[PDB]
Amino acid sequence: RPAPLTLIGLGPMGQAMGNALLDRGHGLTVWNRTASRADALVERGAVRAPDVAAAVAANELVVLSLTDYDAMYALLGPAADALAGKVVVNLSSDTPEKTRAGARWIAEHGGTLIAGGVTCPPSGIGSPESSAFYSGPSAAFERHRETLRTLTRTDYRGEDPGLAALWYQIGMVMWWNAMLGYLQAVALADANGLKAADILPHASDTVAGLPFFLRFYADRIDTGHHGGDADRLAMGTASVEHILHTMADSGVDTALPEAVVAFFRRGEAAGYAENSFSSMVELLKK
Amino acid sequence: PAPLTLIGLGPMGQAMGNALLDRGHGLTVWNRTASRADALVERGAVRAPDVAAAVAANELVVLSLTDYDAMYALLGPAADALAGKVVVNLSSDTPEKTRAGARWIAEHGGTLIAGGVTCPPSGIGSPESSAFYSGPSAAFERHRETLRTLTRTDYRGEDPGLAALWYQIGMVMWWNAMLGYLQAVALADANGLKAADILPHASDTVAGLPFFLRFYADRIDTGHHGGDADRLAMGTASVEHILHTMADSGVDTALPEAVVAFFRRGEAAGYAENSFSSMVELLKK
Amino acid sequence: RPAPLTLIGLGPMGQAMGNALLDRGHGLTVWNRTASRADALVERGAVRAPDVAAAVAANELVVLSLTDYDAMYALLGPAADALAGKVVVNLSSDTPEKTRAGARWIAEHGGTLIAGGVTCPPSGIGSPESSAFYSGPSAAFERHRETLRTLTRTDYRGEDPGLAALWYQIGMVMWWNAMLGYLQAVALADANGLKAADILPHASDTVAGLPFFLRFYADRIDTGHHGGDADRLAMGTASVEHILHTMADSGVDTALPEAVVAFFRRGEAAGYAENSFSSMVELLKKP
Amino acid sequence: RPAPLTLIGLGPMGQAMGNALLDRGHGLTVWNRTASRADALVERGAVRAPDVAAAVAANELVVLSLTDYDAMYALLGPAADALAGKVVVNLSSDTPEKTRAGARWIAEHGGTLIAGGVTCPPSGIGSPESSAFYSGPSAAFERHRETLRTLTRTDYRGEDPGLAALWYQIGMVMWWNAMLGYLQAVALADANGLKAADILPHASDTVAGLPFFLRFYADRIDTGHHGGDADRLAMGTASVEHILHTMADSGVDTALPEAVVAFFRRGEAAGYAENSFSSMVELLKKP
Numbered sequence A: 001r002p003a004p005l006t007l008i009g010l011g012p013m014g015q016a017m018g019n020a021l022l023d024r025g026h027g028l029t030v031w032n033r034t035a036s037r038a039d040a041l042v043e044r045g046a047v048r049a050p051d052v053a054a055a056v057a058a059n060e061l062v063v064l065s066l067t068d069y070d071a072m073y074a075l076l077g078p079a080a081d082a083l084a085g086k087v088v089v090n091l092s093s094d095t096p097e098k099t100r101a102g103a104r105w106i107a108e109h110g111g112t113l114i115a116g117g118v119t120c121p122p123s124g125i126g127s128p129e130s131s132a133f134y135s136g137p138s139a140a141f142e143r144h145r146e147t148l149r150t151l152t153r154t155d156y157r158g159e160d161p162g163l164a165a166l167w168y169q170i171g172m173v174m175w176w177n178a179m180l181g182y183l184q185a186v187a188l189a190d191a192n193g194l195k196a197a198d199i200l201p202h203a204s205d206t207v208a209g210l211p212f213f214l215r216f217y218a219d220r221i222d223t224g225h226h227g228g229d230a231d232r233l234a235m236g237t238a239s240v241e242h243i244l245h246t247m248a249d250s251g252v253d254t255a256l257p258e259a260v261v262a263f264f265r266r267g268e269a270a271g272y273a274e275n276s277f278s279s280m281v282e283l284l285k286k
Numbered sequence B: 001p002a003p004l005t006l007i008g009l010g011p012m013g014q015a016m017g018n019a020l021l022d023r024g025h026g027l028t029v030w031n032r033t034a035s036r037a038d039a040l041v042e043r044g045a046v047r048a049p050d051v052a053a054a055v056a057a058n059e060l061v062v063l064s065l066t067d068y069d070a071m072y073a074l075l076g077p078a079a080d081a082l083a084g085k086v087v088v089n090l091s092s093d094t095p096e097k098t099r100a101g102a103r104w105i106a107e108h109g110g111t112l113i114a115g116g117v118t119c120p121p122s123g124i125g126s127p128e129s130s131a132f133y134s135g136p137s138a139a140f141e142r143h144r145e146t147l148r149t150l151t152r153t154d155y156r157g158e159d160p161g162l163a164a165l166w167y168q169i170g171m172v173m174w175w176n177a178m179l180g181y182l183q184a185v186a187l188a189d190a191n192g193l194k195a196a197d198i199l200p201h202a203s204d205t206v207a208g209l210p211f212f213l214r215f216y217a218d219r220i221d222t223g224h225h226g227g228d229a230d231r232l233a234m235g236t237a238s239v240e241h242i243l244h245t246m247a248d249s250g251v252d253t254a255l256p257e258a259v260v261a262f263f264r265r266g267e268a269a270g271y272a273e274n275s276f277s278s279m280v281e282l283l284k285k
Numbered sequence C, D: 001r002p003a004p005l006t007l008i009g010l011g012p013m014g015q016a017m018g019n020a021l022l023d024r025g026h027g028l029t030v031w032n033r034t035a036s037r038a039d040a041l042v043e044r045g046a047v048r049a050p051d052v053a054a055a056v057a058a059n060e061l062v063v064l065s066l067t068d069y070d071a072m073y074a075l076l077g078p079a080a081d082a083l084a085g086k087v088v089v090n091l092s093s094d095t096p097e098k099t100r101a102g103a104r105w106i107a108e109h110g111g112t113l114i115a116g117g118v119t120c121p122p123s124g125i126g127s128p129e130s131s132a133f134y135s136g137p138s139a140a141f142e143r144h145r146e147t148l149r150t151l152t153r154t155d156y157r158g159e160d161p162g163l164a165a166l167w168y169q170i171g172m173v174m175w176w177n178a179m180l181g182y183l184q185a186v187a188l189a190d191a192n193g194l195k196a197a198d199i200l201p202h203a204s205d206t207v208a209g210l211p212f213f214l215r216f217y218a219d220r221i222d223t224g225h226h227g228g229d230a231d232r233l234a235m236g237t238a239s240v241e242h243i244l245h246t247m248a249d250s251g252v253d254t255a256l257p258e259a260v261v262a263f264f265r266r267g268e269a270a271g272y273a274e275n276s277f278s279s280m281v282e283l284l285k286k287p
């Protein structure tokens, strides 16, 4: 049942990915720019391909966990011709356009690229609650969907490889902003005698109440309802200025809070003070 | 339920007034835009003619204003009658300006209890909602049960600025994620997707955040910035991917650019092989 | 596009699921033994199927909100043959074993059962603040995940159909116990002149401090560390005995507090009095 | 200046009490039966009285952190002739009647007992978010309220010492039951390959969703609205029966789920099957 596969890219994610596959009983062949990284997996039952050309040729499925799509060209460029009949599932982050450019390159060499965006940390590889967006030619994705179901759940977003990257970037823009806000909160807390452990209960309660506002503002934004019934930008403009000045009074970097105040200053200049802060989506759109 | 005066009838004060009447509190209500008091007045609320009478009607005066500067503008005319009053200011501000309002209320013979409501107006009334309180314990304890009608009470200490600090610690994370939601909806609008099409993923992503908050918590507390799970260099690429995805789709790039620049400052600080958590040191400045 | 689906089981949960699905623009075919319960959803724009067979026939996705899995055998029983090609999402509570058996029943009739456990009340259907456990054939779940996301978030726990039920019963043993304790708190308060409103703030402060104790005792239980550093069982056996006698002295039924006292005394009898109350997990690990 | 005081009872809670009193600057005289427990506080500056009598006579304010009120009689009984003019703040859990019995015994010996229910773990002593119910002589409590604020917030519930104990037991019937539910969930999990750390997110999510039901059912119990618009006791009896059989099938102890099942079966027999489980608040008024 568990089909063989080549995994190139053995960082935090691909290492855990190879673990989850060998665990299920898959035929793992691992290659990496840093060949030292392919050693614990190789000791657990994986074959070190001596070259990327041999890696690409060992199996039909080539899974990629690299920092970006440029890393793919740099690793598979030496073996470009060996990509014929091969299916490259790139679980690497990049722009939809750069994701499609990768697909085109694999396509010039007789292979098909399936894009992928894992929405889980390395600890989540092998966990059923973990999911990944996938996009690109259906047949190639479908004939490997079950080996990919070993890593995460499969959410097909379309035939355009760019869609999986677009959906990953949609969730990551919220993830990174919230996590930079955590780092900002931890820094304000350290400047005030507190630890991340002291502010963790509140932080978690704060981010878990977020889905309410996500729903509250979804339909309202999709209809142009930016009424000040639950909030006025003017009140929130004061709120973000309070974060900036509280941070400044406590000696904490003000670059990120000053950039947030600037966005609210643009909303005030657009006449949105009596409207919901949601109105500022019209400054981000188009 | 003990009687009280509530000044500040915007989105939250309106909800607070509805909740105080719902428990049974006799309410004296005043607002600069007196038009915003009509509904609560018909529900049974006495419309104080002026702020002076509002303050004199009850010991407890709860303020729901945009900032602490609004209290000076509203209570300042009748600051003489603030003597013997407990002012529960539920208005956001910096700890230092919250402390200034405490001194101001105290110079007028009163006591300020600082408050930061960590709930929307729709949550006023539910013990699922919480608010930070700070300032003289005695005055807090005296009026804690009237405050429990609006929200649960989370006392953060006798320094009135403490509730404001705790509120700002949550709101930096709250506003950042909500601004990110606005960026996701614009990226989606530019790609034929509505917010309702992206709301599930957005809600799944923000709901998984508590795990990542705990994972990096004790690590940051102990100084562990290992790239065992994440390298700042891959995150710099990830946030740059966000920037160019936004730029390629025609969406505003101001906020993605500030994040890219923050990660590049971290790479310049030598934390490329370390976890993105390492940039907490550049924020401690 | 909002995919069409059939909803059988229009109790408090099923009525709310119908309203949420209609709110997203889903084409809903509905059926309930009591047809008056389908009236409002029909007037909103739902199709009132006359038979249970016709409801199952109308759409591939059949969502069940029934009391138990025995109720699926009763309702879908007549037209079991016509369950072929259909994906039955069973959001009914039951034992992992009974849930697994329902999957085999749906499968022996040509269908696929996705098991589901809604961790929200009816007021939470439609909210992305709400979540539901799902388990069963991965392909069917992925094909219908988006229509189910209209009701709650999706927490897939695996291919074993009994896994959603297990995870649901794990949350429900804590849920029911905390809520039966709230009822006992309300009854002790009434017996002492206090209304539920008077005890609600303290009750909500008590349950909001719980996540701290769940974490505190998690690593300790998983590591076998049941030391009396923060609590000794004998101090807790006294505390549960205080609740019991406080309730007996107040004329409140003592059946539920006698059971808790009996459980703490079992730990004392097994030698765990100087150990944490957490040690009593070792008495539960066996039947 | 932080007023001086005597602390007797240096277990998990008392040690944390002494640490917080010393942290603020209180002249602390400590005494514990197991002397080793004062050792660290004495190096921090705690006096260490030679015996219990010397401790009671050192200060007007004597704080007790013992397992129960029977422990007070056995410790303060040999030093009973020294209790006159002394304010004994007893932070020990016990029933309202036994707390009033301690108040009477203290007053027969010339002193005044103030009852206290600390609704904070030892980790929360010294924390401003922490609270304690207090009941007993108002003036004596008011004279010593500032020193008691060092440990926790002070919520005076009245002149009867039984009021604090009652308020403490009202919260602890809910707390203990939710913790026994957590222990049951961890056992169900262990029998199914899952650790407490694996179920901790769902457990924490389940218990943070409780404050909604507390308010929802508080408003309805107070108004006699035990309608089944959001639930039926019959659907709940099935749910609790599923917890019992899920635990039995997994070889997990059934004594506790059997008692919940028995109470739900008592409600269906009382004619409440079509009503909310909240109707069982009435079964709790008739033993």
Ligand SMILES: NC(=O)C1=CN([C@@H]2O[C@H](COP(=O)(O)OP(=O)(O)OC[C@H]3O[C@@H](n4cnc5c(N)ncnc54)[C@H](OP(=O)(O)O)[C@@H]3O)[C@@H](O)[C@H]2O)C=CC1
Pocket (backbone or CB within 6 Å): A230, A231, A232, A235, A239, B008, B009, B010, B011, B012, B013, B031, B032, B033, B034, B036, B064, B065, B066, B067, B069, B070, B071, B073, B074, B090, B091, B092, B116, B117, B118, B119, B120, B121
């Ligand atoms: N959901 C929410 O709105 C939340 C807000 N908060 C905080 O609660 C507070 C109230 O916010 P919100 O309910 O939106 O109300 P607003 O901030 O929109 O306004 C609150 C009240 O303050 C009055 N006010 C504003 N400026 C002045 C001034 N210069 N002088 C006198 N009165 C003034 C308004 O007057 P008028 O109506 O007469 O024009 C209104 O009655 C804020 O500090 C906010 O940060 C906390 C949590 C969530």
Ligand SMILES: NC(=O)C1=CN([C@@H]2O[C@H](COP(=O)(O)OP(=O)(O)OC[C@H]3O[C@@H](n4cnc5c(N)ncnc54)[C@H](OP(=O)(O)O)[C@@H]3O)[C@@H](O)[C@H]2O)C=CC1
Pocket (backbone or CB within 6 Å): C009, C010, C011, C012, C013, C014, C032, C033, C034, C037, C065, C066, C067, C068, C071, C072, C074, C075, C091, C092, C093, C118, C119, C120, C121, C122, D230, D231, D232, D235, D239
């Ligand atoms: N109630 C809640 O808050 C929550 C409950 N759940 C779960 O959701 C499920 C649905 O329960 P809920 O809708 O709340 O309430 P009910 O259990 O009362 O509703 C279930 C349905 O069963 C139907 N039914 C009655 N008799 C039979 C029968 N003989 N054969 C088949 N079906 C029958 C009822 O129809 P009729 O109108 O004719 O009686 C009703 O539509 C349960 O399994 C429960 O554990 C989980 C989340 C929250």
Ligand SMILES: NC(=O)C1=CN([C@@H]2O[C@H](COP(=O)(O)OP(=O)(O)OC[C@H]3O[C@@H](n4cnc5c(N)ncnc54)[C@H](OP(=O)(O)O)[C@@H]3O)[C@@H](O)[C@H]2O)C=CC1
Pocket (backbone or CB within 6 Å): C230, C231, C232, C235, C239, D009, D010, D011, D012, D013, D014, D032, D033, D034, D037, D065, D066, D067, D068, D070, D071, D072, D074, D075, D091, D092, D093, D094, D118, D119, D120, D121, D122
């Ligand atoms: N998390 C918690 O533990 C909380 C507990 N409480 C309540 O606070 C009280 C104390 O808590 P905790 O410290 O855990 O309790 P313990 O029972 O673990 O210890 C309390 C102290 O009582 C002393 N003691 C008991 N009997 C006698 C006696 N006959 N003579 C002299 N000393 C005696 C013990 O002295 P020795 O060292 O010699 O045994 C010990 O120091 C209890 O009533 C408890 O219900 C409330 C809030 C939280």
Ligand SMILES: NC(=O)c1ccc[n+]([C@@H]2O[C@H](COP(=O)([O-])OP(=O)(O)OC[C@H]3O[C@@H](n4cnc5c(N)ncnc54)[C@H](OP(=O)(O)O)[C@@H]3O)[C@@H](O)[C@H]2O)c1
Pocket (backbone or CB within 6 Å): A009, A010, A011, A012, A013, A014, A032, A033, A034, A037, A065, A066, A067, A068, A070, A071, A072, A074, A075, A091, A092, A093, A094, A118, A119, A120, A121, A122, B229, B230, B231, B234, B238
């Ligand atoms: N880490 C997470 O938590 C997480 C979760 C989901 C998504 N992701 C995405 O998953 C991908 C992998 O992230 P990661 O943290 O596991 O790993 P990473 O730190 O991005 O490194 C992954 C791999 O990329 C290789 N690589 C990087 N640049 C290269 C180049 N120019 N040429 C050749 N190889 C190159 C590295 O090779 P060496 O071994 O030689 O260094 C390494 O094996 C990223 O695209 C990321 O956005 C991250």
Ligand SMILES: Fc1ccc(F)c(C2=NCCC2)c1
Pocket (backbone or CB within 6 Å): A118, A119, A120, A121, A175, B208, B229, B230, B235
């Ligand atoms: F949940 C997710 C999803 C995608 C991710 F890249 C992450 C990361 N964790 C550490 C850095 C990226 C977490």
Ligand SMILES: Fc1ccc(F)c(C2=NCCC2)c1
Pocket (backbone or CB within 6 Å): A230, A231, A236, A239, A277, B117, B118, B119, B120, B174
């Ligand atoms: F829209 C707004 C504006 C300001 C706010 F503080 C909020 C909040 N909701 C709960 C956290 C604060 C929402």
Ligand SMILES: Fc1ccc(F)c(C2=NCCC2)c1
Pocket (backbone or CB within 6 Å): C118, C119, C120, C121, D209, D230, D231, D236, D239
């Ligand atoms: F949040 C939840 C989850 C599952 C449930 F069964 C409930 C219930 N509410 C009333 C009884 C069962 C609530």
Ligand SMILES: Fc1ccc(F)c(C2=NCCC2)c1
Pocket (backbone or CB within 6 Å): C209, C230, C231, C236, C239, D118, D119, D120, D121, D175
């Ligand atoms: F482990 C225990 C034992 C007895 C207790 F009272 C407590 C707590 N009380 C307030 C919350 C924790 C914890």
